Amino acid sequence: MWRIWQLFDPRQALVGLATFLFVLALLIHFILLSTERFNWLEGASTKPVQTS
DSSP H helical ranges for the chain: 10-42
| Of 34, 14, 38, residue with least CA distance to 47 | 38
Are the CB atoms for 10 and 17 separated by under 8 Å?
no
Dist. CA 34–CA 26, nearest whole Å: 11
Residues 6 or more apart whose CB falls under 8 angstroms from that of 46 comprise 39, 40
Experimental method for this entry? NMR
Residue 39 amino acid letter: N
Binding residues for a bacteriochlorophyll, as ranges, are 29
The distance between the two most distant Cα atoms of the chain, rounded to a whole number of Å, is: 71
Binding residues, as ranges, are 29
Dist. CA 35–CA 27, nearest whole Å: 11
Domain 1-43 has CATH 4.10.220.20: yes
CA atoms within 13 A on the CB side of 15: 5
